[PDB]
Design a protein around this ligand. Sequence first.
Ligand code: PSF
Ligand code: PSF
Ligand code: CA
Ligand code: CA
Ligand code: CA
Ligand code: CA
Ligand code: CA
Ligand code: CA
Ligand code: CA
Ligand code: CA
Ligand code: CA
Ligand code: CA
Length: 1687
Amino acid sequence: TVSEAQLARRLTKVKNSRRMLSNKPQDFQIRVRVIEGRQLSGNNIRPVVKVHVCGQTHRTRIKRGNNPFFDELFFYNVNMTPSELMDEIISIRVYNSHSLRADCLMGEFKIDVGFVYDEPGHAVMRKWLLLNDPEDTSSGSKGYMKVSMFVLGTGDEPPPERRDRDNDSDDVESNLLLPAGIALRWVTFLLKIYRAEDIPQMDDAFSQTVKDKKNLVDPFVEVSFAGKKVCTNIIEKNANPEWNQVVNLQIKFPSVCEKIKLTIYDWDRLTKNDVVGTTYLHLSKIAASVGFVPTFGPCYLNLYGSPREYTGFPDPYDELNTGKGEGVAYRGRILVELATFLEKTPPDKKLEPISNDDLLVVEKYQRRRKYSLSAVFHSATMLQDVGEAIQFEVSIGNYGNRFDTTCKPLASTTQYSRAVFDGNYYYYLPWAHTKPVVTLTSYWEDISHRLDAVNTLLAMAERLQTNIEALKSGIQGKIPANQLAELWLKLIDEVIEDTRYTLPLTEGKANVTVLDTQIRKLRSRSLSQIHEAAVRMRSEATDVKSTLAEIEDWLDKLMQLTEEPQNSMPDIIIWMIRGEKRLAYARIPAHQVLYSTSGENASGKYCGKTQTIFLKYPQEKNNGPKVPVELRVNIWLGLSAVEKKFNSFAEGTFTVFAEMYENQALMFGKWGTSGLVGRHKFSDVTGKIKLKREFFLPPKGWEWEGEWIVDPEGHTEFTDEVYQNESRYPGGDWKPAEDTYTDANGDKAASPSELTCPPGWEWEDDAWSYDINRAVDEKGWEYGITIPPDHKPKSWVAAEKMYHTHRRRRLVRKRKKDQEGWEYASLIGWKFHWKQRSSDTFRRRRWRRKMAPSETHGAAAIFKLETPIVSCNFDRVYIYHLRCYVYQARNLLALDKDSFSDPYAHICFLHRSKTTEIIHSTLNPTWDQTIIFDEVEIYGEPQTVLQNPPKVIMELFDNDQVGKDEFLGRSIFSPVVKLNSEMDITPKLLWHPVMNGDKACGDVLVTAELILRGKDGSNLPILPPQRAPNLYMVPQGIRPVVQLTAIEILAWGLRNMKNFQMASITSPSLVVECGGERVESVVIKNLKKTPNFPSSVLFMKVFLPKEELYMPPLVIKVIDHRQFGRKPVVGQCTIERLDRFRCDPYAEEEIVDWWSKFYASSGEHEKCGQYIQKGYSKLKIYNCELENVAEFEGLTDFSDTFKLYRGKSDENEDPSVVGEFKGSFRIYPLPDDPSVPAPPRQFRELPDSVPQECTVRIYIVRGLELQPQDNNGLCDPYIKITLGKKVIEDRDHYIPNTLNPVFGRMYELSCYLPQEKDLKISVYDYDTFTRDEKVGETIIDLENRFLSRFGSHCGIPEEYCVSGVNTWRDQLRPTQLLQNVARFKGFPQPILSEDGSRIRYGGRDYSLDEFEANKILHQHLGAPEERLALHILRTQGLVPEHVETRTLHSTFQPNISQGKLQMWVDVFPKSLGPPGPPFNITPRKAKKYYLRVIIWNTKDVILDEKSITGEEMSDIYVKGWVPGNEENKQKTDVHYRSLDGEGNFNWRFVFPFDYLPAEQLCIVAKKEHFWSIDQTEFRIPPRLIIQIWDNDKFSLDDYLGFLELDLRHTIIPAKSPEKCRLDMIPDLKAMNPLKAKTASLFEQKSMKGWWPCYAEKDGARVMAGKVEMTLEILNEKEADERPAGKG
Ligand SMILES: CCCCCC(=O)OC[C@H](COP(=O)(O)OC[C@H](N)C(=O)O)OC(=O)CCCCC
Ligand SMILES: CCCCCC(=O)OC[C@H](COP(=O)(O)OC[C@H](N)C(=O)O)OC(=O)CCCCC
Ligand SMILES: [Ca+2]
Ligand SMILES: [Ca+2]
Ligand SMILES: [Ca+2]
Ligand SMILES: [Ca+2]
Ligand SMILES: [Ca+2]
Ligand SMILES: [Ca+2]
Ligand SMILES: [Ca+2]
Ligand SMILES: [Ca+2]
Ligand SMILES: [Ca+2]
Ligand SMILES: [Ca+2]
């Protein structure tokens, strides 16, 4: 089917155009411009064009004739998401207009913005449209419309144009926007919506608790597609609704929408409709190109969003329910199906019931299979908070939810564990050898045929990506070619052995959809293509450095194949619950842990493997300053039928304890079993339920271990912590509490003067101190309030208030190197602690028995227990030894007010933490420190550690002397694991990003290694050398190998230095620090007087790493030497990309003006003119800036520009720019032998650094497509130029009513470079009664023009002319410029011959005849030696004579072009002399013409319109006018009472019109109303419209027919009225017409003959008559030679 192929190709174009687009809403600008209408329907119409994009509307003025010309440009400014703006439509509707009535619709065209995003150049150019009625399209077309539309986002620019103006006008049938084969075809999607389930409670339960807790929701689905929203029925009071309703989505092929948005809403009668959840169906992801149409389902789509717990208060995370944010809890799921029906249009029912046979079909997609989940919680580290206990809930879907009411108790949560200080900074849950185990059972559809293929292709691409990074490491480490070829052959053999995999069959399985079969066919085709390309490349390719592009193509193809839109299995969400409140979440995709019987590859990556997940706060997109917890968890999901296969995945021995409590009390100082306050002797934990010993029995698959007995349950450095607490009444005075010293238990503890060291320990510091590195006041106290029954606080603030009742202070100190089982409390059922205090009068003891699984069931008996609680016991501990080589950091955030930081780092690994040193006043620290954790206890087998190592976390902090230490970022990386000695290789330092928030805020050069510690640590390597006590250096193998290099700094000068401490930078100096070395420039005496350093060359010999990867950043500082010896830092920059700085140190009436040259160099106007044939000069028009031309290197080849910064940053971003340092660097290694001489310096050709007075001539040519600044869509632009303090405002010489203003004006200035180097060219809008609006601005570094090698101070023309128009405008002759660029390059002085026939340059002799080969020379050329010097001056990349096109920028839209400005700048330094004659770029005037017609005869004119005289009769007379010259409407005399349609007139006409011969376009100026401020300038092609009128004695004048003749392309007439046939005019509407014989009236100055006249009746041409006339065009000279006559 042809149409399904077109839909598939369009959707795959949308797919591969939307695969890099982000989701952050940014700014977009849409330019839609109409040009010209052709063959518009109707009779004597007055057409306008109205464009409606996204609510903003624009409209062109009233034009005339059926072939109108508008040339109107319209703008639209929106800020949408770059995956959402492709839902909008552009509507072009054409309206006939009447003088006294409303408009009438004639044409209508819709188009998606996606296709005009999709086009090359991000825009379509000069394309034609099909105008038709929006639903009466069977009546035929009603005209054509030439438009152009543009899409530009951040950094995008519109494309330029060529000479295609005569290619697009008559040849419409090749320049359509859409061809005829696509047509106006409807596309229908039948989105059947069957049912939903597990919808959360979204209504109040107060109504139902007075008159069920599960069904308090009234859901319906709102389906948003292409702007339209269709709402299904409301199912009142049903958490499992059943709609069974098709939604007939509709589009057309010109407007293809991609994103379907399903949104379940709770219907509320009074309040707003709450949002349950949102899913998306991506049509580009469920369709492909044989290919297939969009298909989906019947498959459940899981919703995610806010937590399911209902609160009547407004929901704080309700933005997650709208689809923004990733969603933290399961919100239910909805069963949908999607089909595509093509070329059939459904009826007006948007919503129909699902047919019953589809309801019996869908039952096989709802089959439930039992699933078993097990989670072994290994470690919960990096906790920031110790107050109250922490548990973890595992839930998949709604199964395992702790807060949901349920019939039986569930084992979905771990026990409440209190955190334990690790001795340095963090906390960890003390799980040790007894890990918590969570087991829950669920029921989902067995969609294993999808997830098997997904997991196997994911394992394929993971192996391929591992081999890809292996080859990348091989080519970056410069490995020998044999090992690289071996790694490449291993990659290719692994790809060959992988992609012979056969996908799971679609037969015999109930849940196979149509999309499953099409996806399997696409996957088989892609895998066979990858396999065959792999065998072909193994058999044919040798260059392994060229095939990796196809290998990355294989990688992103495999990434495309792993996308499963039908993943109905919901994510497993792990929730940390501190107290009774949900705190942090982590979503694991359930396919990643799903077990498959098809093998290890079909199982998930983390199926039965310990994985490290970082929990997140419920609306943070990523981890911020505080990670809540780091979890290592061993999750196994699988079918409950194959749950006996969990025995292979299980490590350790599972264990459940049955418990029994025995209680006593105290009378008269003796304990006894009586006296209990409402509690039993043998009872439960609460004591209220009496339970026997025989009540606990082992279930099936379990057995007893042991017997019923009484069971009451490597740090070299450490830091203790005690807390001091005070209590008071509100408004009272503070006094110490009864628990004056507390701990993590929450009760009284030992005094700081009471606790001592353990044996084998010692004290580092003998005095206690209070911690100031917390959220406290100046004295180290936090404050809080208490509400009963919580008499002790759980949250604290950093400030004191009068209502606070408690306060707390942390104290720290550094450290180095009974059996009866009775637990006592002051009450029964209270908190029993280990030993009896003075107030305890009650006691109890625990008494238990261990249970173990039977050997016949294995470790899978934990799934048969469904309160029995499971814990996994490891019988062996494995000791490890981690070494983190923290070398350095770069580009850290500035978080102090002295524009630096004091960065240190918390190295964390499992339950261990240490801290690096604090490096003061730097953003690029070099810690050079090895952080050693000996004796790290990790449980599980060492192979599981080797496969999935625990992460090392690098939390960087700016140290502050007062207050909190601010957060710099976080680097997470894995250590290389060494389980033995045989694979002992040197670990390699890598730059890991310091992720702060959403972006990287630097990199750290860090690696780590985790060695399995043997017996007495004998296999461990030797300790690194110590540069300080307990301070290890990075050892010699890991540290970068340094060589003596040299850094040359061209300290040229400082620009734009802003004020520091309200005083200007008067006496600055430069400090360049790199590699621990520094150099300092001399102090500038006055920056206002001299802005450049007097000594511009600095030099330092720094030991720098040999590897280009390990190169440290280069730090630039500016120090303002002020009074009293104060030397603050007023600017700093960091330059890490030093690869660019590496260098090898040993390496008729042809009136000629400037505008004729500009047109001939444009290529659009006068391309075939005689100007090029006679061989005059040209110029090079750039479509961008001169700094954006890659040939001239951005004009910073002498010295770059590095922006300096100051102060604290903008919390994620760069700080405020306080200046610029202009300079460059040359880094090159030095010989280590002092006897070998140094390499020569790279800076010897330096110019004079004093300020230079210069005359800058700013030629401004024209503007292109500005932003409108008036309400009528127009502008009145003028030029405002600022240059330091000088300002030229050309407000008196503004150009009225132009979006394309031909300025043509010079603005000559004088300035002192480089104090006034910033040349600002701003275009401003004239307004008479209001303020002026800035259209945009451009910034030109005039010093970059002045100091460049490329000669950008003045472009060099094609030929050296002395007199005339193209005179030499530079100060230096081409010989002087040639010898200057010879002296720049190191070439010798050029040799000038006496006759000028030859010169020498660059070691090559040049000759005049090598460039003057058969070229016609004229009288404007000058000296031959200067001509030859210029003829060789254009060959070495110098800047030619040019018109650059600089894009205007504004704060309206930051990186979006506000317009274009064609112009150029000539900087002339006054030390070289005065410049030459200036160019006259004044715009040329219009040549006046008179178009004279003489109306000879008429023949076969149609009969009269019905008048009062009531006869079959005819009156004929002829009108004629030019569009734009309707004030020149004249007419002939009347031939009354024609009996056969003939009429003699001989009435002469004279048409005054002004013309542009070079632009081939008529020019007219006329105000658009009488009260207009200024005269509108109108640019239209020259066309003559002659129409036949009718006159009556009493009734009005009537219209019969028309003809239209473009004066450049006039229709050659017939020589007789009987030979005056129709269709000489191209019909161009119903069939492909014959080409009209066309000739220009401007050259062929006169012609005579008969022309056809026609009018359209019901879309078909009808002969309205014939006319004989003679057309002649004469200019002013011919009007002077012979008179024009009457008219
Ligand atoms: C006696 C019952 C009167 C009930 C009167 C009534 O109409 O109350 C409506 C409000 C809001 O209820 P919603 O369903 O909009 O909750 C929307 C949801 N919070 C969300 O944002 O997701 O109910 C409550 O505040 C809870 C009951 C308060 C009862 C005082
Ligand atoms: C109510 C009287 C004060 C009104 C002051 C005021 O704000 O006027 C703005 C308007 C439109 O001004 P512009 O055409 O420059 O458009 C500006 C562009 N749309 C923008 O981006 O702002 O002025 C008039 O209508 C002209 C008569 C003014 C008569 C003072
Ligand atoms: Ca509600
Ligand atoms: Ca409701
Ligand atoms: Ca509501
Ligand atoms: Ca700080
Ligand atoms: Ca600091
Ligand atoms: Ca204005
Ligand atoms: Ca204006
Ligand atoms: Ca204004
Ligand atoms: Ca009439
Ligand atoms: Ca008449």
